[PDB]
Design a protein around this nucleic acid. Structure first.
Lengths: 1364, 87
RNA sequence: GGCGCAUAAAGAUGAGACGCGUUUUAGAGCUAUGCUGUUUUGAAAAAAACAGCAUAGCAAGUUAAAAUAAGGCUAGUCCGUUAUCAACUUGAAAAAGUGGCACCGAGUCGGUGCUU
């Protein structure tokens, strides 16, 4: 039985379909497992697979980092206890035990309630003598007297847990800490970045302006007023305002799509800037790094202000002066309140619920809520000056422990610790004998290259241990082999190229890679010298000359710098039409300018032998971060550099990764040529090509050369192969589930291998569907065109961006009110019957772009041919269209489309292009899917190595099946029901297998493998129509869907009519049965049984909701620790039910507590799952259930399908609720009438079906009441939402005489009431009908459990009511 | 106003949101799970009104509707009526 | 679909560190009014509150300790929210195995015939 399989790959579903030769969908009676009356179910062999998406591994990485950092923190506390173990035991024994039980209730505690000092008296005098710990800190640095042991331990014990960022390197000096050198570092970055428009910041004083307190926004324009001028919205201006703490926009600063707001204090910055970076390019991230660094300098000058007794008192005096300003400012403020208002004094100070004082201190609030609360109220107060300066200065009432503590360099804690150790070195000699251990503890830092301290037990770490003892920070060097472990860190952190595996890719800023990309921009340069009329690609003499001149001179090179400084300075040409680069270069030798600026030796950089030396330096400056292994790795290069630049070279860094490896560029060669990719970029003859053609040169060796490496060596199983891929995790989950569905699928049909496997896959978009993300872009095209013209069309008719998407008006604004074909003026009001004709008609390429469609009055203004537009028009209009050329109204591609009449007509290369745009599969991961499905199915070798390729792997593109679907009107409303995916995969099989029937002769372009290389250099006829049943040519017309039609309309009303039942000439076998295929396939798509399987899951993830709630006494809380009361200590709430167990047991009924045989649902947390697997029956007797019956323990996961009366299918949501399962069988004429009802204003084609489909919409008003009938008498069987149903029926009866379009739109919105999964809300015309779910679960006990296979073709039906 | 407006800030309140939708599956039913339970909440995207405007248009009010289990959730959403409008 | 310049881009991935935030406790609340409690002089009320309670008015109000997914054993200054998954058949797992074909019609698949 010959058959083939259609598939479709999204990210939540996969469509699977089985077709036969006449495209009749098969159907089989099936075996039923369980205990029902029915023992066979006839099912159609077509459906889809639904499943929840596959999340990335980011959150688990973050919580892993959090657990590790709290682990190291607590173990630092354990270290400090280890040093002060004995002497603290000398004075007071249970002190550390008091610190251990600081968290309990005094009932639960077994020592004194006062942790510090034991008594009441020294504790009260402790808080009165020292209110904070900072007073104690500044006391202990500025002391001569002895102090208490537990006091000093508590001091330095505070000094360990909070140590500030290690992100500065070195010590505190104006090279890295003052605002002047870092500000001028930013200045050199800015002017040295641009090289044009040089600004000055020499005589200005950013220390005096930025350092002293004032208003921030008032400070903002002042530094603008000290520089000569950029703007108040300058890039430097918004940059420095960003560095102060204001969060500016950067939309108009770079002319980007959306707004570009960044908050440095927000945690979004560390990737949101990255998404900003992807809209500007990588050249600016160092400038943003300098902005962040200078912002840290501003914050450091903000926190340190005291400078009088600066001898070892940098911090604590500033903190306690801030404490005092809080104190006296509170007193004067309260005196101002009671002095002025005896109302709202309680609302400020006794509230803790309205963002007041008590909320900012004792309640739950923040400083934004408090300042935003008090600011009009304090503004209302009668006499109140010199406090708004604290409002704009953030100075009033500000606490100690804030979010601005993230600025603190650890050296302040280091030396501040250190002076305390100097004042205490004399009294307590243990400190004197342990001080290097103390500063060693504080200054410890696990490097990047080391990684975690495993013992081979991790999944993630790679440490090797040169000695074998406990890894301790006293003697950290005694264990670590940095060479071997860091060598693994070189190996564990490099990536492998897909385009060249078994090899390590390059860093991003390699000199080799930058030569690759600068040459990859210069390979597209095709310049016209004025007098040859020839855009000629460059020579290696020319390219090497320019690289010798310009790319070794400056980074950002414009075209006027280019043609001025080369073509006239060297070559003496005035105007050269350099067609490739518009203004500036996408690639630049920035690292070349870096190191050439550093070591100042052009001979050293132009050596061919120091290149791999620079690969070592680029590699080490790429990877490592800890400076010691930075410098020793270049002690190998201690010879070349005489230590001056090595005072600087260790600082400079580079991040990123190249997409290629050196063995793919400067590795393999053409054996015919003996040339690397660099050699082709410096010598590609007359035809200099881009690297995408260097891969895809099918005549040349490089597709074979890469492809012999793309095949694996010793291949692993399926799972590691899927782990080798490149995409989202969810698309990989779609690949794996696709393979599983193919596996069970071929296990269904006789265990016979299939014949053709078609794949469609396109996903991962977030571009907001281009409704309003495009009118600003094409409106910007209007503003550029009108900007160059000056013929102000926007003075007599300005239009709106809701109506800018419609192509008629937009094409009217494109051509400056002048028609292309006839030199005439297109009138304003007659745009309705104005015609939209294509450059190349609808028989050669299905194109709806701007690049093809132009606006005119008549179709006959073009000429008389389906060929290129007539030479009585282009030669006629070679002036105004060249004005469109000079003003950039058209691209060069659309230019040669319009000036294709220069080429006479459509050539072999033309139809070569139009055929090779329909079918060339250009997604990498799609070809990988084709390889993985290729490996499993075809496995019969021969005596040779030949894969006997019985199974064809056909890959299509969405334009073919999509435009087939739209042309033959088999419409697709994504919102009726989930059946549409299976119909999409079915049509994928239709178009794919129709291609393998009609054209087997060029299977080698849309099937992976090695078929015949016979192509369209001879399959295109060099003349008109080939003869009947004697055609060696493919066809004439570049569309491949023409033979499904009846009429092939030419550009003259001419019906090219192709034969009815299509065959193939070389086979003599029929390929298209036009007489019955559309009633057949239309009968297929209207089928009421389509296999829908929502895939089951075991719910994993986090334990519960994480925000810790206060100590109430509700009995549904989960304790944080096992010794902690959920009442007397609080805890978490709302756990995560992994899966629901179904249990028969006996509860103790009534006051007599007698065994009552029940069968009830029970939810399971994830926090009890491993306990449930370890012993379930002891867990359930621990739950309070007796007489467990283990053979009736029914594990019911999430989305386990249940069946009720009339086939009322419902999906099991969790233990607490249900979800809704049955589907909708809709006749296809209703689907089409809702489609064209929805598409009435956006029909997008010829007026024949605009009027035809329009009147056809106007026919069937009956269909609307038939659809509401279907939802009516359908919804009473399975939904049972009675009041909602009467609301929508009555509301439907109200607005019956509505305008048709939006009425049908509200019908489409009314279809959500049926759909699968969660209950939703929706809005018929104005009345938004509220959702309604089913929290009940008692009915499922009396229902039909169904277990499903992964294709839903082995149902297993279990009845709960038959169970005892 | 954006999608990751709602994702990040409703993420910041102690709920879980993990939407699922891309081409060609032209549906973007985000999931809410107002209780960590089978009481998940859902809004789609359809052709006329983006899911931001579906969200704020669906939650200008408090909780006042039928179910007595979700109301604090709606109160949470009440706060995020006002933050994105005046930032 | 965006073909967005006929071209087609960019991808999972894992190591370091801060800063919060949250929660419980320590941060003795003071005075006046009224109440429950034992004393006190008492054949019973009767202050001495030492306490607790509630209500008013006052008073201060910034910080610390601990934990930060339950915990696990392999006990490491490691790991625990990723991917992975119907059922029954064995098998510790790893895994492997488990179900006829044509024809007719279509309201969630049903019916007919044959092979058994």
């Amino acid at each position: 039985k010959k058959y083939s399989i259609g598939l479709d790959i999204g990210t939540n579903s996969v469509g699977w379909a089985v077709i036969t030769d006449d495209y009749k969908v098969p159907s089989k009676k099936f075996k039923v497992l369980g205990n029902t009356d029915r023992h066979s179910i006839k099912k159609n062999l077509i459906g889809a697979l639904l499943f929840d998406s596959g999340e990335t591994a980011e959150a688990t990485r973050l919580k892993r980092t959090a657990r590790r950092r709290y682990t190291r923190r607590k173990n630092r506390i354990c270290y400090l206890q280890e040093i002060f173990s004995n002497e603290m035991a000398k004075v007071d024994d249970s002190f550390f035990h008091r610190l251990e039980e600081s968290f309990l209730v005094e009932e639960d505690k077994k020592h004194e309630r006062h942790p510090i000092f034991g008594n009441i008296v020294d504790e009260v005098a402790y808080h009165e003598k020292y209110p904070t710990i900072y007073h104690l800190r500044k006391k202990l640095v500025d002391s001569t007297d002895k102090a208490d042991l537990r006091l000093i331990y508590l001091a330095l014990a505070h000094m360990i847990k909070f140590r500030g960022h290690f992100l500065i390197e070195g010590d505190l000096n104006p090279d890295n800490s003052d605002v002047d050198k870092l500000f001028i570092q930013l200045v050199q970055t800015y002017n040295q970045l641009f090289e044009e428009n040089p600004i000055n910041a020499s005589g200005v004083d950013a220390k005096a302006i930025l350092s002293a307190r004032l208003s921030k926004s008032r400070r903002l324009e002042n530094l603008i007023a000290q520089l000569p001028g950029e703007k108040k919205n300058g890039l430097f201006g918004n940059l420095i305002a960003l560095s102060l703490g204001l969060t500016p926009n950067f939309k108009s600063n770079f002319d980007l799509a959306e707004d570009a707001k960044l908050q440095l204090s927000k945690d979004t910055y560390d990737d949101d800037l990255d998404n900003l970076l992807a809209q500007i390019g990588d050249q600016y991230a160092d400038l943003f790094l300098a902005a962040k660094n200078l912002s840290d300098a501003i914050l450091l000058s903000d926190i340190l202000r005291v400078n009088t007794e600066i001898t070892k008192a940098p911090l604590s005096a500033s903190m306690i002066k801030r404490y005092d300003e809080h104190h006296q400012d509170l007193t004067l403020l309260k005196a101002l309140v009671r002095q002025q208002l005896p109302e709202k004094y309680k609302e400020i100070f006794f509230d803790q619920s309205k963002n007041g004082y008590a909320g900012y201190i004792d309640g739950g609030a923040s400083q934004e809520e408090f300042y935003k609360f008090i600011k009009p109220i304090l503004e209302k107060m009668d006499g109140t000056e010199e406090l708004l300066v604290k409002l704009n200065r953030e100075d009033l009432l500000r606490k100690q422990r804030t979010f601005d503590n993230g600025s603190i360099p650890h050296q302040i804690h280091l030396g501040e610790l250190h002076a305390i150790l100097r004042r205490q070195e004399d009294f307590y000699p243990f400190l004197k004998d342990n001080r290097e251990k103390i500063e060693k503890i504080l200054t410890f830092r696990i490097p990047y290259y080391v990684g975690p301290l495993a013992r081979g037990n991790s999944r993630f770490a790679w440490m090797t241990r040169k000695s074998e003892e406990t890894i301790t920070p006293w003697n950290f060097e005694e264990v670590v082999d940095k060479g071997a472990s860091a060598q693994s860190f070189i190996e564990r952190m490099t990536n492998f190229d897909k385009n060249l595996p078994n090899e390590k890719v390059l860093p991003k800023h390699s000199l080799l890679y930058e030569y690759f990309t600068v040459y990859n921009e210069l390979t597209k340069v095709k310049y016209v010298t004025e007098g040859m009329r020839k855009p000629a690609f460059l020579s290696g003499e020319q390219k090497k000359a320019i690289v010798d001149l310009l790319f070794k001179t400056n980074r950002k090179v414009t075209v006027k710098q280019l043609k001025e400084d080369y073509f006239k300075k060297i070559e003496c040409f005035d105007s050269v039409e350099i067609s490739g680069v518009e203004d500036r270069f996408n690639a630049s030798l920035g690292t070349y300018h870096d190191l050439l600026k550093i070591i100042k030796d052009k001979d050293f950089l132009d050596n061919e032998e120091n290149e791999d030396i620079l690969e070592d330096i680029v590699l080490t400056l790429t990877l490592f971060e800890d400076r010691e292994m930075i410098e020793e790795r270049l002690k190998t290069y201690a010879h070349l550099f005489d230590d001056k630049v090595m005072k600087q070279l260790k600082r400079r860094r580079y991040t990123g990764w190249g997409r290629l490896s050196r063995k793919l560029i400067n590795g393999i060669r053409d054996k015919q040529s003996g040339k690397t990719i660099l050699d082709f970029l410096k010598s590609d003859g007359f035809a200099n090509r881009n690297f995408m053609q260097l891969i895809h040169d099918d005549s040349l060796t490089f597709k074979e050369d890469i492809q012999k490496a793309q095949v694996s060596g010793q291949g692993d199983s399926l799972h590691e192969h899927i782990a080798n891929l490149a995409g989202s995790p969810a698309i990989k989950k779609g690949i794996l589930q696709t393979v599983k569905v193919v596996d069970e699928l071929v296990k269904v049909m006789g265990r016979h291998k299939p014949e053709n496997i078609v794949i469609e896959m396109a996903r991962e978009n977030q571009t907001t569907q281009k409704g309003q993300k495009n009118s600003r872009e094409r409106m910007k095209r209007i503003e550029e065109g009108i900007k160059e013209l000056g013929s102000q069309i926007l003075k007599e008719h300005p239009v709106e961006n809701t109506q800018l998407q419609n192509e008629k008006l937009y094409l009217y604004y494109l051509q400056n009110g002048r028609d292309m074909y006839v030199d005439q003026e297109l009138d304003i009001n007659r745009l309705s019957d104005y015609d939209v004709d294509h450059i190349v008609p609808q028989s050669f390429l299905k194109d709806d772009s701007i690049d093809n469609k132009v606006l005119t009055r008549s179709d006959k203004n073009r000429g008389k041919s389906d060929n290129v537009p007539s030479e009585e028009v282009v030669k006629k209009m070679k002036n105004y269209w060249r004005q469109l050329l000079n003003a950039k109204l058209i691209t060069q591609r659309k230019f040669d489309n319009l000036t294709k009449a220069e080429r006479g007509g459509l050539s072999e290369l033309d139809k070569a292009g139009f055929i090779k745009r329909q079918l060339v599969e250009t997604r990498q991961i799609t070809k990988h899917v084709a390889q993985i499905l290729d490996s499993r199915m075809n496995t019969k070798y021969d005596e040779n190595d030949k894969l006997i390729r019985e199974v064809k792997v056909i890959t299509l593109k969405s334009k073919l099946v999509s435009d087939f679907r739209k042309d033959f009107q088999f419409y697709k409303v994504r919102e009726i029901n989930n059946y549409h995916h299976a119909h999409d995969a079915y049509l994928n099989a239709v178009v794919g297998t129709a291609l393998i029937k009609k054209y087997p002769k060029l299977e080698s372009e849309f099937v992976y493998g090695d078929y015949k290389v016979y192509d369209v250099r001879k399959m295109i006829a060099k003349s008109e129509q080939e003869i009947g049943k004697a055609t060696a040519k493919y066809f004439f017309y570049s569309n491949i869907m023409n033979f499904f039609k009846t009429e092939i309309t030419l550009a003259n009303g001419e019906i090219r009519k192709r034969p009815l039942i299509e065959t193939n000439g070389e086979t003599g076998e029929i390929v298209w049965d036009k007489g019955r295929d559309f009633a057949t396939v239309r009968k297929v798509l209207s089928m009421p049984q389509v296999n829908i399987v929502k895939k089951t899951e075991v719910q994993t993830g986090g334990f519960s909701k994480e925000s810790i709630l206060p100590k109430r006494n509700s009995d549904k809380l989960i304790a944080r620790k096992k010794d902690w009361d959920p009442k007397k200590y609080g805890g978490f709430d709302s756990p995560t039910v992994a899966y629901s167990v179904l249990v028969v047991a006996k509860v103790e009924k009534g006051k007599s507590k007698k065994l009552k045989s029940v069968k009830e649902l029970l939810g399971i947390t994830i926090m009890e799952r491993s306990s449930f697997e370890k012993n379930p029956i002891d867990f359930l007797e621990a739950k309070g259930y007796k007489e467990v019956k283990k053979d009736l323990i029914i594990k019911l996961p999430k989305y386990s399908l249940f069946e009720l009366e009339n086939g009322r299918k419902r999906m099991l949501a969790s233990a607490g609720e249900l979800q809704k399962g049955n589907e909708l069988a809709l006749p296809s004429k209703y689907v089409n009438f809702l489609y064209l009802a929805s598409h009435y204003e956006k029909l997008k084609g010829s007026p024949e079906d605009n009027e035809q489909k329009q009147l056809f919409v106007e026919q069937h008003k009956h269909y609307l009441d038939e659809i509401i009938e279907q939802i009516s008498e359908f919804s009473k069987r399975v939904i049972l939402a009675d009041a909602n149903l009467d609301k929508v029926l009555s509301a439907y009866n109200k607005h019956r005489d509505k305008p048709i379009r939006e009425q049908a739109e509200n019908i489409i919105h009314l279809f959500t009431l049926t759909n699968l999964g969660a209950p939703a809300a929706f809005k018929y015309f104005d009345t938004t009908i509220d959702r309604k779910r089913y929290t009940s679960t008692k009915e499922v006990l009396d229902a039909t459990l169904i277990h499903q296979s992964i294709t839903g073709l082995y149902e297993t039906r279990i009845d709960l009511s038959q169970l005892g | 106003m954006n999608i990751n407006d709602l994702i990040r800030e409703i993420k910041n309140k102690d709920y879980t949101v993990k939407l699922s939708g891309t081409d060609s599956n032209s549906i973007t039913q985000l999931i809410i799970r107002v209780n960590n339970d089978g009481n998940e909440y859902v809004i789609s995207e359809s052709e006329n009104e983006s899911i931001v405007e579906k969200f704020i248009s669906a939650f200008k009010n408090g909780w006042n509707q039928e179910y007595e289990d979700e109301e604090e959730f709606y109160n949470d959403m009440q706060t995020i009526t006002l933050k994105s409008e005046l930032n």
